Design an enzyme around this catalytic site. Structure first.
Site, PDB file in Angstrom:
ATOM      1  N   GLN A 170      50.165  30.619  39.717  1.00 43.80           N
ATOM      2  CA  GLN A 170      49.270  31.648  40.117  1.00 43.80           C
ATOM      3  C   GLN A 170      49.577  32.734  39.208  1.00 43.80           C
ATOM      4  N   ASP A 171      48.761  33.747  39.289  1.00 39.07           N
ATOM      5  CA  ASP A 171      48.543  34.581  38.170  1.00 39.07           C
ATOM      6  C   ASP A 171      49.692  35.197  37.432  1.00 39.07           C
TER       7      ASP A 171
END
Lengths: 177, 290, 159
Positions: free
Chosen positions: C54-55
Protein backbone atom coordinates in the site's frame (compact mmCIF):
# COMPACT_ATOMS: atom_id res chain seq x y z
CA UNK A 1 -1.41 16.09 38.60
CA UNK A 2 -0.55 17.45 41.86
CA UNK A 3 3.12 17.56 41.07
CA UNK A 4 4.81 18.49 37.89
CA UNK A 5 7.98 16.99 39.11
CA UNK A 6 9.51 14.83 41.60
CA UNK A 7 13.14 15.05 41.83
CA UNK A 8 15.11 13.12 44.27
CA UNK A 9 17.91 15.00 45.66
CA UNK A 10 21.27 14.73 47.01
CA UNK A 11 23.01 17.54 48.81
CA UNK A 12 25.26 18.51 45.87
CA UNK A 13 23.51 21.72 44.82
CA UNK A 14 22.11 19.13 42.67
CA UNK A 15 19.24 16.80 42.99
CA UNK A 16 20.41 13.30 42.32
CA UNK A 17 17.60 12.30 39.78
CA UNK A 18 14.44 13.76 38.37
CA UNK A 19 11.49 13.41 36.23
CA UNK A 20 9.52 15.84 34.36
CA UNK A 21 5.96 14.91 34.15
CA UNK A 22 5.31 17.41 31.45
CA UNK A 23 7.81 18.84 28.97
CA UNK A 24 7.49 22.13 27.20
CA UNK A 25 10.23 24.46 28.37
CA UNK A 26 13.69 23.43 29.23
CA UNK A 27 15.41 22.61 32.43
CA UNK A 28 15.74 26.21 33.28
CA UNK A 29 12.44 25.80 34.95
CA UNK A 30 13.97 22.57 36.20
CA UNK A 31 17.45 23.97 35.68
CA UNK A 32 16.65 27.08 37.68
CA UNK A 33 15.00 24.99 40.33
CA UNK A 34 18.10 22.81 40.56
CA UNK A 35 20.28 25.87 40.98
CA UNK A 36 18.10 27.34 43.74
CA UNK A 37 18.00 23.93 45.56
CA UNK A 38 21.75 23.55 45.41
CA UNK A 39 22.08 27.06 46.81
CA UNK A 40 19.58 26.24 49.53
CA UNK A 41 19.58 30.00 49.96
CA UNK A 42 22.08 29.50 52.77
CA UNK A 43 18.99 29.15 54.90
CA UNK A 44 19.59 27.30 58.13
CA UNK A 45 17.14 24.46 58.88
CA UNK A 46 13.47 23.55 58.36
CA UNK A 47 12.31 20.68 56.18
CA UNK A 48 9.76 22.71 54.42
CA UNK A 49 9.96 25.97 52.69
CA UNK A 50 7.41 27.29 50.38
CA UNK A 51 8.18 30.48 49.02
CA UNK A 52 6.24 32.48 46.69
CA UNK A 53 3.49 30.22 46.84
CA UNK A 54 5.58 27.44 45.83
CA UNK A 55 6.03 24.67 48.11
CA UNK A 56 9.26 23.35 47.98
CA UNK A 57 8.87 20.34 49.72
CA UNK A 58 11.72 18.35 50.86
CA UNK A 59 12.92 16.08 53.46
CA UNK A 60 16.42 15.76 54.36
CA UNK A 61 17.11 12.24 54.61
CA UNK A 62 20.72 12.45 55.38
CA UNK A 63 22.80 14.36 52.96
CA UNK A 64 19.88 13.75 50.70
CA UNK A 65 16.84 15.59 50.19
CA UNK A 66 13.83 14.11 48.56
CA UNK A 67 11.89 16.87 46.83
CA UNK A 68 8.41 17.58 45.58
CA UNK A 69 7.01 20.78 44.47
CA UNK A 70 3.65 22.46 44.48
CA UNK A 71 2.14 25.94 44.63
CA UNK A 72 -1.52 25.95 45.71
CA UNK A 73 -2.85 24.35 48.94
CA UNK A 74 -2.63 20.68 50.05
CA UNK A 75 -3.38 18.38 53.01
CA UNK A 76 -0.11 17.96 54.74
CA UNK A 77 0.12 14.59 56.31
CA UNK A 78 -0.32 12.67 53.27
CA UNK A 79 2.48 14.51 51.82
CA UNK A 80 4.71 13.75 54.66
CA UNK A 81 3.98 10.21 54.32
CA UNK A 82 5.26 10.36 50.98
CA UNK A 83 8.53 11.98 51.75
CA UNK A 84 9.06 9.60 54.40
CA UNK A 85 7.70 6.95 52.27
CA UNK A 86 10.34 7.60 49.78
CA UNK A 87 12.66 7.25 52.60
CA UNK A 88 11.17 3.81 53.17
CA UNK A 89 11.28 2.73 49.57
CA UNK A 90 14.66 3.33 48.07
CA UNK A 91 16.94 0.69 49.47
CA UNK A 92 14.47 -1.65 48.00
CA UNK A 93 14.06 0.08 44.69
CA UNK A 94 17.43 0.92 43.52
CA UNK A 95 19.23 -0.71 46.27
CA UNK A 96 20.34 1.06 49.38
CA UNK A 97 21.81 4.56 49.01
CA UNK A 98 24.70 5.82 46.89
CA UNK A 99 23.91 7.41 43.60
CA UNK A 100 25.28 4.73 41.55
CA UNK A 101 23.05 1.99 42.55
CA UNK A 102 20.31 4.16 41.54
CA UNK A 103 22.33 5.11 38.51
CA UNK A 104 21.97 1.51 37.51
CA UNK A 105 18.35 1.34 38.51
CA UNK A 106 17.29 4.57 37.13
CA UNK A 107 14.67 3.05 35.07
CA UNK A 108 13.34 1.29 38.07
CA UNK A 109 13.30 4.42 40.09
CA UNK A 110 11.48 6.62 37.55
CA UNK A 111 9.12 3.81 37.04
CA UNK A 112 8.50 3.94 40.73
CA UNK A 113 7.48 7.62 40.60
CA UNK A 114 4.85 6.92 38.03
CA UNK A 115 3.80 3.82 39.63
CA UNK A 116 3.59 5.24 43.02
CA UNK A 117 1.98 8.34 42.11
CA UNK A 118 -0.24 8.87 39.40
CA UNK A 119 -0.35 12.55 39.15
CA UNK A 120 -0.29 13.47 42.74
CA UNK A 121 -2.47 10.57 43.76
CA UNK A 122 -1.18 8.05 46.30
CA UNK A 123 -1.67 4.96 44.31
CA UNK A 124 -1.13 1.91 46.73
CA UNK A 125 0.97 0.15 49.39
CA UNK A 126 3.26 -2.82 49.23
CA UNK A 127 6.43 -2.43 47.40
CA UNK A 128 6.82 -5.98 46.29
CA UNK A 129 3.38 -5.94 45.05
CA UNK A 130 4.36 -2.82 43.32
CA UNK A 131 7.00 -4.76 41.47
CA UNK A 132 4.26 -7.01 40.38
CA UNK A 133 2.43 -4.81 38.06
CA UNK A 134 4.84 -4.74 35.25
CA UNK A 135 8.06 -6.52 34.41
CA UNK A 136 6.55 -8.96 36.80
CA UNK A 137 3.13 -9.87 35.55
CA UNK A 138 1.21 -13.22 35.22
CA UNK A 139 -1.45 -13.06 32.50
CA UNK A 140 0.96 -12.87 29.67
CA UNK A 141 2.59 -16.07 30.74
CA UNK A 142 -0.67 -17.90 31.04
CA UNK A 143 -1.54 -16.93 27.59
CA UNK A 144 1.90 -17.62 26.23
CA UNK A 145 2.25 -21.16 27.29
CA UNK A 146 -0.99 -22.23 25.87
CA UNK A 147 -0.75 -20.21 22.75
CA UNK A 148 2.83 -20.66 21.98
CA UNK A 149 2.25 -24.22 22.38
CA UNK A 150 -0.70 -24.35 20.09
CA UNK A 151 1.15 -22.59 17.39
CA UNK A 152 4.04 -24.80 18.10
CA UNK A 153 1.91 -27.79 17.34
CA UNK A 154 0.89 -26.30 14.08
CA UNK A 155 4.54 -25.60 13.54
CA UNK A 156 5.67 -29.08 14.47
CA UNK A 157 3.23 -30.55 12.13
CA UNK A 158 4.36 -27.97 9.67
CA UNK A 159 7.90 -29.20 10.19
CA UNK A 160 6.79 -32.49 8.84
CA UNK A 161 4.90 -30.86 5.94
CA UNK A 162 7.79 -28.74 5.14
CA UNK A 163 10.19 -31.53 5.72
CA UNK A 164 8.75 -33.81 3.23
CA UNK A 165 7.14 -31.47 0.76
CA UNK A 166 -32.65 19.13 64.06
CA UNK A 167 -29.12 20.31 64.14
CA UNK A 168 -28.89 21.33 60.53
CA UNK A 169 -31.78 23.37 60.98
CA UNK A 170 -30.37 25.25 63.88
CA UNK A 171 -27.77 26.48 61.66
CA UNK A 172 -30.01 26.87 58.75
CA UNK A 173 -32.49 29.06 60.40
CA UNK A 174 -29.88 31.28 61.88
CA UNK A 175 -28.30 31.64 58.60
CA UNK A 176 -31.56 32.00 56.84
CA UNK A 177 -32.41 34.90 59.02
CA UNK B 1 37.02 6.49 9.01
CA UNK B 2 34.86 4.10 11.35
CA UNK B 3 32.77 4.81 14.67
CA UNK B 4 31.78 3.46 18.12
CA UNK B 5 28.10 3.50 17.05
CA UNK B 6 29.16 0.32 15.51
CA UNK B 7 31.02 -0.55 18.72
CA UNK B 8 27.72 -0.53 20.46
CA UNK B 9 26.15 -2.63 17.73
CA UNK B 10 28.38 -5.58 18.22
CA UNK B 11 27.98 -5.38 21.97
CA UNK B 12 24.28 -5.85 21.55
CA UNK B 13 24.82 -9.03 19.65
CA UNK B 14 27.39 -10.09 22.08
CA UNK B 15 25.13 -9.83 25.01
CA UNK B 16 21.75 -9.66 23.59
CA UNK B 17 19.43 -7.62 25.60
CA UNK B 18 22.10 -7.35 28.24
CA UNK B 19 24.52 -5.53 26.16
CA UNK B 20 21.77 -3.57 24.72
CA UNK B 21 20.85 -2.49 28.18
CA UNK B 22 24.17 -1.04 28.47
CA UNK B 23 23.63 0.51 25.20
CA UNK B 24 20.40 2.01 26.36
CA UNK B 25 22.07 3.60 29.28
CA UNK B 26 24.78 5.01 27.21
CA UNK B 27 22.33 6.05 24.63
CA UNK B 28 20.37 7.52 27.32
CA UNK B 29 23.17 9.50 28.60
CA UNK B 30 23.94 10.46 25.05
CA UNK B 31 20.31 11.22 24.52
CA UNK B 32 20.32 13.09 27.81
CA UNK B 33 22.68 15.63 26.33
CA UNK B 34 20.44 15.87 23.36
CA UNK B 35 23.03 14.32 21.16
CA UNK B 36 23.17 11.29 18.97
CA UNK B 37 23.57 10.83 15.28
CA UNK B 38 21.24 8.43 13.63
CA UNK B 39 21.68 4.90 12.24
CA UNK B 40 21.11 2.67 15.21
CA UNK B 41 17.49 3.38 14.40
CA UNK B 42 17.88 0.91 11.74
CA UNK B 43 19.15 -1.69 14.09
CA UNK B 44 16.52 -0.98 16.46
CA UNK B 45 14.08 -1.23 13.82
CA UNK B 46 15.40 -4.49 12.63
CA UNK B 47 15.56 -6.43 15.73
CA UNK B 48 12.70 -4.91 17.71
CA UNK B 49 9.52 -5.74 15.78
CA UNK B 50 10.74 -9.39 15.87
CA UNK B 51 12.03 -9.00 19.57
CA UNK B 52 10.67 -9.18 23.09
CA UNK B 53 12.85 -7.85 25.90
CA UNK B 54 10.07 -6.20 27.73
CA UNK B 55 12.05 -4.08 30.02
CA UNK B 56 14.10 -2.95 27.18
CA UNK B 57 11.06 -2.17 25.27
CA UNK B 58 10.02 -0.18 28.21
CA UNK B 59 13.27 1.65 28.17
CA UNK B 60 13.06 2.05 24.49
CA UNK B 61 9.64 3.23 24.54
CA UNK B 62 10.13 5.71 27.17
CA UNK B 63 13.08 6.91 25.33
CA UNK B 64 10.89 7.53 22.40
CA UNK B 65 8.49 9.28 24.57
CA UNK B 66 10.81 11.65 26.21
CA UNK B 67 12.68 12.21 23.12
CA UNK B 68 10.99 13.82 20.26
CA UNK B 69 9.05 11.91 17.75
CA UNK B 70 7.92 14.59 15.28
CA UNK B 71 11.60 14.12 14.57
CA UNK B 72 13.00 15.86 11.59
CA UNK B 73 12.34 12.55 9.75
CA UNK B 74 8.75 13.74 9.68
CA UNK B 75 6.90 14.04 12.09
CA UNK B 76 7.50 10.33 12.64
CA UNK B 77 10.76 8.52 11.87
CA UNK B 78 8.09 7.45 9.38
CA UNK B 79 7.45 3.95 10.67
CA UNK B 80 5.26 5.28 13.49
CA UNK B 81 2.45 3.29 11.99
CA UNK B 82 3.85 -0.03 11.01
CA UNK B 83 5.71 -1.06 14.21
CA UNK B 84 2.82 0.06 16.17
CA UNK B 85 0.74 -2.74 14.78
CA UNK B 86 2.69 -5.18 16.98
CA UNK B 87 2.44 -2.73 19.73
CA UNK B 88 -1.22 -2.25 18.98
CA UNK B 89 -1.42 -5.91 19.49
CA UNK B 90 0.29 -5.48 22.71
CA UNK B 91 -2.04 -2.76 23.39
CA UNK B 92 -4.61 -5.18 22.35
CA UNK B 93 -2.78 -7.70 24.21
CA UNK B 94 -4.97 -9.95 26.07
CA UNK B 95 -2.15 -9.51 28.50
CA UNK B 96 -3.67 -6.85 30.81
CA UNK B 97 -0.65 -5.48 32.74
CA UNK B 98 1.11 -5.34 29.51
CA UNK B 99 -1.64 -3.27 28.00
CA UNK B 100 -1.88 -1.23 31.20
CA UNK B 101 1.76 -0.49 31.16
CA UNK B 102 1.45 0.48 27.60
CA UNK B 103 -1.45 2.56 28.55
CA UNK B 104 0.60 4.23 31.12
CA UNK B 105 2.97 4.94 28.48
CA UNK B 106 0.18 5.73 26.25
CA UNK B 107 -1.00 8.43 28.51
CA UNK B 108 2.37 9.79 27.90
CA UNK B 109 2.07 8.84 24.21
CA UNK B 110 0.28 11.06 21.76
CA UNK B 111 1.09 9.83 18.19
CA UNK B 112 -1.96 10.21 15.92
CA UNK B 113 -1.90 8.00 12.87
CA UNK B 114 -1.25 5.22 15.29
CA UNK B 115 -4.00 6.48 17.59
CA UNK B 116 -6.89 6.28 15.33
CA UNK B 117 -7.56 2.54 15.27
CA UNK B 118 -6.08 2.44 18.61
CA UNK B 119 -9.05 4.44 19.52
CA UNK B 120 -10.94 1.30 18.72
CA UNK B 121 -8.32 -0.66 20.40
CA UNK B 122 -8.53 1.27 23.60
CA UNK B 123 -12.18 0.98 23.70
CA UNK B 124 -11.86 -2.70 23.89
CA UNK B 125 -9.30 -2.46 26.64
CA UNK B 126 -11.61 -0.48 28.83
CA UNK B 127 -13.78 -3.50 29.10
CA UNK B 128 -11.03 -5.56 30.56
CA UNK B 129 -11.77 -6.42 34.12
CA UNK B 130 -8.76 -4.62 35.41
CA UNK B 131 -9.22 -1.40 37.06
CA UNK B 132 -5.59 -0.66 36.47
CA UNK B 133 -6.12 -0.77 32.82
CA UNK B 134 -9.29 1.13 32.86
CA UNK B 135 -7.88 3.83 35.13
CA UNK B 136 -5.04 4.24 32.77
CA UNK B 137 -7.51 5.04 30.07
CA UNK B 138 -8.70 7.90 32.28
CA UNK B 139 -5.34 9.54 32.07
CA UNK B 140 -4.99 8.73 28.51
CA UNK B 141 -8.26 10.29 27.70
CA UNK B 142 -7.34 13.25 29.66
CA UNK B 143 -4.37 13.44 27.41
CA UNK B 144 -6.68 13.33 24.44
CA UNK B 145 -8.99 15.85 25.69
CA UNK B 146 -6.46 18.48 25.32
CA UNK B 147 -4.64 17.05 22.31
CA UNK B 148 -7.41 15.78 20.27
CA UNK B 149 -10.39 15.71 22.33
CA UNK B 150 -12.45 15.55 19.26
CA UNK B 151 -10.61 12.49 18.18
CA UNK B 152 -13.17 11.12 20.39
CA UNK B 153 -16.11 13.48 20.54
CA UNK B 154 -18.96 11.57 22.34
CA UNK B 155 -17.00 11.01 25.43
CA UNK B 156 -18.32 13.17 28.29
CA UNK B 157 -21.50 11.42 28.41
CA UNK B 158 -20.00 8.18 27.55
CA UNK B 159 -18.01 8.44 30.59
CA UNK B 160 -20.88 9.49 32.58
CA UNK B 161 -22.86 6.44 31.67
CA UNK B 162 -19.73 4.51 32.24
CA UNK B 163 -19.69 5.73 35.79
CA UNK B 164 -23.00 4.13 36.12
CA UNK B 165 -21.55 0.80 35.09
CA UNK B 166 -18.66 1.42 37.38
CA UNK B 167 -17.97 0.95 41.10
CA UNK B 168 -14.14 0.99 41.78
CA UNK B 169 -13.51 3.97 43.90
CA UNK B 170 -10.10 4.46 42.52
CA UNK B 171 -11.35 4.65 39.12
CA UNK B 172 -14.29 6.73 40.24
CA UNK B 173 -12.13 9.26 41.86
CA UNK B 174 -10.37 9.64 38.58
CA UNK B 175 -13.55 9.63 36.80
CA UNK B 176 -14.65 12.64 38.64
CA UNK B 177 -11.52 14.48 38.08
CA UNK B 178 -11.74 14.22 34.45
CA UNK B 179 -15.48 14.47 34.27
CA UNK B 180 -15.81 17.86 35.67
CA UNK B 181 -13.05 19.04 33.35
CA UNK B 182 -15.10 17.79 30.44
CA UNK B 183 -18.27 18.96 32.03
CA UNK B 184 -19.42 19.53 35.49
CA UNK B 185 -23.04 19.04 34.55
CA UNK B 186 -22.85 15.30 34.46
CA UNK B 187 -21.11 15.23 37.75
CA UNK B 188 -23.79 17.43 39.14
CA UNK B 189 -26.58 15.28 37.98
CA UNK B 190 -24.87 12.51 39.69
CA UNK B 191 -24.15 14.79 42.57
CA UNK B 192 -27.81 15.19 43.12
CA UNK B 193 -27.99 11.48 43.35
CA UNK B 194 -25.13 10.98 45.54
CA UNK B 195 -25.93 13.47 48.06
CA UNK B 196 -26.91 11.10 50.88
CA UNK B 197 -24.49 8.45 49.98
CA UNK B 198 -21.42 10.57 50.32
CA UNK B 199 -20.97 10.22 53.92
CA UNK B 200 -20.47 6.62 53.56
CA UNK B 201 -17.67 7.15 51.24
CA UNK B 202 -14.02 7.55 50.81
CA UNK B 203 -12.66 10.94 50.78
CA UNK B 204 -10.59 11.41 47.79
CA UNK B 205 -13.29 11.60 45.28
CA UNK B 206 -15.27 13.87 47.66
CA UNK B 207 -12.50 16.39 47.55
CA UNK B 208 -12.64 16.96 43.92
CA UNK B 209 -16.15 18.25 44.02
CA UNK B 210 -15.16 20.86 46.51
CA UNK B 211 -13.00 22.57 44.00
CA UNK B 212 -15.54 22.57 41.27
CA UNK B 213 -18.35 24.14 43.02
CA UNK B 214 -16.32 27.11 43.87
CA UNK B 215 -15.64 28.60 40.50
CA UNK B 216 -19.20 28.67 39.32
CA UNK B 217 -20.86 30.93 41.91
CA UNK B 218 -18.70 33.92 41.48
CA UNK B 219 -19.81 33.73 37.91
CA UNK B 220 -23.47 32.97 38.95
CA UNK B 221 -25.59 31.31 41.69
CA UNK B 222 -29.26 30.44 42.72
CA UNK B 223 -28.55 26.70 43.39
CA UNK B 224 -28.40 26.24 47.14
CA UNK B 225 -30.83 23.98 48.77
CA UNK B 226 -30.00 20.73 47.31
CA UNK B 227 -26.55 21.45 48.15
CA UNK B 228 -27.28 22.54 51.61
CA UNK B 229 -29.02 19.47 52.43
CA UNK B 230 -25.84 17.70 51.79
CA UNK B 231 -23.64 20.32 53.15
CA UNK B 232 -25.06 20.03 56.50
CA UNK B 233 -24.15 16.40 56.40
CA UNK B 234 -20.72 17.53 55.57
CA UNK B 235 -20.87 19.27 58.82
CA UNK B 236 -19.91 16.15 60.34
CA UNK B 237 -16.42 16.50 58.83
CA UNK B 238 -13.75 14.28 60.37
CA UNK B 239 -10.62 13.37 58.48
CA UNK B 240 -7.80 15.66 58.95
CA UNK B 241 -7.97 16.18 55.35
CA UNK B 242 -11.66 16.45 55.44
CA UNK B 243 -11.67 18.80 58.22
CA UNK B 244 -8.88 20.74 56.70
CA UNK B 245 -10.82 21.34 53.66
CA UNK B 246 -14.17 21.38 55.28
CA UNK B 247 -13.71 24.48 57.24
CA UNK B 248 -11.72 25.95 54.33
CA UNK B 249 -14.50 25.44 51.82
CA UNK B 250 -17.00 26.80 54.25
CA UNK B 251 -15.44 30.13 54.46
CA UNK B 252 -15.21 30.20 50.80
CA UNK B 253 -18.82 29.77 50.73
CA UNK B 254 -19.84 31.86 53.61
CA UNK B 255 -18.81 34.34 56.17
CA UNK B 256 -21.98 34.81 58.29
CA UNK B 257 -21.15 35.40 61.98
CA UNK B 258 -22.38 31.98 62.54
CA UNK B 259 -20.16 30.83 59.68
CA UNK B 260 -17.29 32.69 61.15
CA UNK B 261 -17.74 30.84 64.28
CA UNK B 262 -18.04 27.41 62.70
CA UNK B 263 -14.89 27.45 60.86
CA UNK B 264 -13.17 29.10 63.71
CA UNK B 265 -13.86 26.33 65.97
CA UNK B 266 -12.59 23.86 63.56
CA UNK B 267 -9.40 25.59 63.56
CA UNK B 268 -9.00 26.06 67.07
CA UNK B 269 -9.40 22.48 67.90
CA UNK B 270 -7.40 21.57 65.03
CA UNK B 271 -4.53 23.53 66.12
CA UNK B 272 -4.76 22.20 69.45
CA UNK B 273 -4.67 18.79 68.14
CA UNK B 274 -2.07 19.97 65.65
CA UNK B 275 1.48 19.17 65.79
CA UNK B 276 3.24 20.10 62.54
CA UNK B 277 4.04 23.62 63.05
CA UNK B 278 4.43 24.29 59.49
CA UNK B 279 0.85 23.60 59.23
CA UNK B 280 0.01 25.76 62.05
CA UNK B 281 1.48 28.72 60.48
CA UNK B 282 -0.38 28.19 57.32
CA UNK B 283 -3.73 28.46 58.78
CA UNK B 284 -2.70 31.59 60.31
CA UNK B 285 -1.92 32.92 57.13
CA UNK B 286 -5.30 32.33 56.08
CA UNK B 287 -6.32 33.77 59.23
CA UNK B 288 -4.15 36.67 58.62
CA UNK B 289 -6.17 37.18 55.52
CA UNK B 290 -9.32 36.72 57.33
CA UNK C 1 17.51 -14.59 5.50
CA UNK C 2 15.31 -11.78 4.87
CA UNK C 3 12.34 -12.97 3.05
CA UNK C 4 9.88 -10.53 1.67
CA UNK C 5 6.04 -10.87 1.37
CA UNK C 6 4.85 -7.87 -0.46
CA UNK C 7 1.80 -6.72 -2.15
CA UNK C 8 -0.94 -5.10 -0.15
CA UNK C 9 -1.20 -7.24 2.87
CA UNK C 10 -4.56 -6.92 4.20
CA UNK C 11 -6.23 -9.01 1.69
CA UNK C 12 -5.29 -12.14 3.15
CA UNK C 13 -1.89 -11.57 1.89
CA UNK C 14 -1.75 -11.37 5.55
CA UNK C 15 -4.19 -14.32 5.81
CA UNK C 16 -1.65 -16.25 3.84
CA UNK C 17 0.81 -15.33 6.44
CA UNK C 18 -1.34 -15.99 9.55
CA UNK C 19 -2.16 -19.33 8.22
CA UNK C 20 1.49 -20.14 8.16
CA UNK C 21 2.18 -18.69 11.44
CA UNK C 22 -0.42 -19.91 13.74
CA UNK C 23 -2.41 -21.85 11.31
CA UNK C 24 -4.83 -18.92 11.71
CA UNK C 25 -6.13 -16.12 9.57
CA UNK C 26 -6.32 -12.38 9.35
CA UNK C 27 -7.54 -11.35 12.81
CA UNK C 28 -5.99 -8.00 12.51
CA UNK C 29 -7.09 -5.08 10.53
CA UNK C 30 -5.70 -5.56 7.00
CA UNK C 31 -2.06 -4.94 7.60
CA UNK C 32 0.09 -2.30 5.91
CA UNK C 33 3.13 -2.84 8.16
CA UNK C 34 5.97 -5.31 8.78
CA UNK C 35 4.66 -8.49 10.06
CA UNK C 36 7.49 -10.57 11.49
CA UNK C 37 8.13 -14.04 11.93
CA UNK C 38 11.10 -16.09 12.00
CA UNK C 39 10.58 -19.58 10.64
CA UNK C 40 13.48 -21.92 11.25
CA UNK C 41 14.84 -24.10 8.49
CA UNK C 42 18.48 -25.19 7.73
CA UNK C 43 18.43 -23.02 10.61
CA UNK C 44 18.37 -20.14 8.61
CA UNK C 45 15.42 -18.60 10.38
CA UNK C 46 13.49 -16.74 7.72
CA UNK C 47 12.43 -13.32 8.79
CA UNK C 48 9.42 -12.55 6.99
CA UNK C 49 8.25 -9.00 6.37
CA UNK C 50 4.65 -9.29 5.32
CA UNK C 51 4.22 -5.86 4.14
CA UNK C 52 1.52 -4.24 2.40
CA UNK C 53 2.38 -2.74 -0.92
CA UNK C 54 0.00 0.00 0.00
CA UNK C 55 0.99 3.37 -0.74
CA UNK C 56 3.62 4.63 1.71
CA UNK C 57 4.61 1.30 2.65
CA UNK C 58 5.40 0.34 -0.81
CA UNK C 59 6.87 3.81 -1.21
CA UNK C 60 9.08 3.61 1.65
CA UNK C 61 11.02 0.60 2.50
CA UNK C 62 14.57 2.06 2.16
CA UNK C 63 15.83 0.91 5.41
CA UNK C 64 14.70 -2.40 4.13
CA UNK C 65 16.73 -1.67 1.15
CA UNK C 66 19.73 -3.66 2.28
CA UNK C 67 20.15 -7.14 0.60
CA UNK C 68 17.65 -9.84 0.13
CA UNK C 69 17.84 -13.46 0.66
CA UNK C 70 14.36 -14.87 -0.07
CA UNK C 71 11.30 -14.06 -2.22
CA UNK C 72 7.72 -14.73 -1.64
CA UNK C 73 5.38 -12.93 -3.81
CA UNK C 74 1.92 -13.69 -2.13
CA UNK C 75 -0.64 -13.50 -4.89
CA UNK C 76 -4.18 -12.69 -5.38
CA UNK C 77 -4.79 -15.06 -8.15
CA UNK C 78 -7.95 -13.10 -8.66
CA UNK C 79 -5.67 -10.15 -9.09
CA UNK C 80 -4.73 -10.14 -12.58
CA UNK C 81 -5.04 -6.44 -12.23
CA UNK C 82 -2.09 -4.76 -10.75
CA UNK C 83 0.33 -7.24 -12.14
CA UNK C 84 1.16 -5.54 -15.44
CA UNK C 85 1.32 -2.48 -13.51
CA UNK C 86 3.38 -4.45 -11.09
CA UNK C 87 5.66 -5.57 -13.82
CA UNK C 88 6.10 -1.91 -14.47
CA UNK C 89 7.08 -1.32 -10.89
CA UNK C 90 9.01 -4.59 -10.58
CA UNK C 91 11.63 -3.49 -12.94
CA UNK C 92 12.99 -1.17 -10.30
CA UNK C 93 13.58 -4.16 -8.07
CA UNK C 94 15.24 -5.59 -11.01
CA UNK C 95 17.09 -2.44 -11.16
CA UNK C 96 18.11 -3.18 -7.71
CA UNK C 97 21.08 -5.40 -7.17
CA UNK C 98 20.42 -6.40 -3.60
CA UNK C 99 17.70 -7.80 -5.56
CA UNK C 100 19.67 -10.60 -7.30
CA UNK C 101 20.59 -12.28 -4.03
CA UNK C 102 17.72 -14.68 -3.74
CA UNK C 103 16.69 -17.88 -5.59
CA UNK C 104 12.94 -17.50 -5.44
CA UNK C 105 9.28 -18.22 -5.25
CA UNK C 106 6.36 -16.43 -6.49
CA UNK C 107 3.41 -17.89 -4.72
CA UNK C 108 0.12 -17.92 -6.38
CA UNK C 109 -2.39 -17.51 -3.63
CA UNK C 110 -6.13 -16.98 -3.85
CA UNK C 111 -6.89 -19.71 -6.34
CA UNK C 112 -10.11 -21.06 -4.69
CA UNK C 113 -10.80 -17.47 -4.25
CA UNK C 114 -12.04 -16.87 -7.63
CA UNK C 115 -9.62 -18.42 -10.03
CA UNK C 116 -6.02 -18.13 -11.40
CA UNK C 117 -3.93 -17.77 -14.77
CA UNK C 118 -1.64 -20.18 -16.75
CA UNK C 119 1.42 -20.72 -14.64
CA UNK C 120 3.06 -19.43 -17.70
CA UNK C 121 0.49 -16.72 -18.30
CA UNK C 122 1.45 -15.04 -15.22
CA UNK C 123 5.08 -15.75 -15.79
CA UNK C 124 5.44 -13.38 -18.59
CA UNK C 125 2.93 -11.08 -17.17
CA UNK C 126 4.79 -9.99 -14.11
CA UNK C 127 7.91 -10.12 -16.20
CA UNK C 128 8.98 -13.23 -14.36
CA UNK C 129 9.81 -15.30 -17.47
CA UNK C 130 12.77 -13.18 -18.02
CA UNK C 131 15.11 -14.04 -15.10
CA UNK C 132 17.86 -16.35 -14.61
CA UNK C 133 20.53 -14.64 -12.67
CA UNK C 134 18.46 -15.77 -9.89
CA UNK C 135 16.78 -19.03 -10.22
CA UNK C 136 13.19 -19.14 -11.10
CA UNK C 137 11.14 -22.22 -10.71
CA UNK C 138 7.53 -21.37 -10.09
CA UNK C 139 5.20 -22.39 -7.23
CA UNK C 140 1.39 -21.97 -6.84
CA UNK C 141 -0.25 -21.92 -3.48
CA UNK C 142 -3.67 -20.60 -2.86
CA UNK C 143 -4.52 -19.29 0.55
CA UNK C 144 -6.76 -22.25 1.32
CA UNK C 145 -4.36 -24.49 -0.54
CA UNK C 146 -0.62 -24.92 -1.32
CA UNK C 147 1.74 -27.95 -1.00
CA UNK C 148 5.08 -29.02 -2.51
CA UNK C 149 5.87 -25.44 -1.77
CA UNK C 150 8.70 -26.54 0.10
CA UNK C 151 10.17 -28.28 -2.93
CA UNK C 152 10.34 -24.88 -4.37
CA UNK C 153 11.93 -23.61 -1.27
CA UNK C 154 14.09 -26.66 -0.93
CA UNK C 155 16.04 -25.84 -3.95
CA UNK C 156 15.90 -22.28 -2.94
CA UNK C 157 17.95 -22.17 0.30
CA UNK C 158 20.09 -24.80 -1.11
CA UNK C 159 20.84 -22.68 -4.09
Amino acid sequence: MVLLAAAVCTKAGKAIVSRQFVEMTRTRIEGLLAAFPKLMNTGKQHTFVETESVRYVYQPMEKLYMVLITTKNSNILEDLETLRLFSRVIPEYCRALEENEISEHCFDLIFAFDEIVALGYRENVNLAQIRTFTEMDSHEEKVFRAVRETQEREAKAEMRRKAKEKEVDNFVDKLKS
Amino acid sequence: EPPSEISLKNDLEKGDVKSKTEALKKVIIMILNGEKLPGLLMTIIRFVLPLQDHTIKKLLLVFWEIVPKTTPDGRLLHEMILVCDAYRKDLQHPNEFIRGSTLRFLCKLKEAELLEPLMPAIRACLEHRHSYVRRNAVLAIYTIYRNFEHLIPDAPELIHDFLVNEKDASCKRNAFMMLIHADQDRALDYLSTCIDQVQTFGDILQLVIVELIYKVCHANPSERARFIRCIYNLLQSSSPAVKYEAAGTLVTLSSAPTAIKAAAQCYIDLIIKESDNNVKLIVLDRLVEL
Amino acid sequence: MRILMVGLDGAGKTTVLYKLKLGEVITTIPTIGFNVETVQYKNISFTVWDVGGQDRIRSLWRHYYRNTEGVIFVVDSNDRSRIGEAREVMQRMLNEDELRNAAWLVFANKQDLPEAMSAAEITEKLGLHSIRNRPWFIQATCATSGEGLYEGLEWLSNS
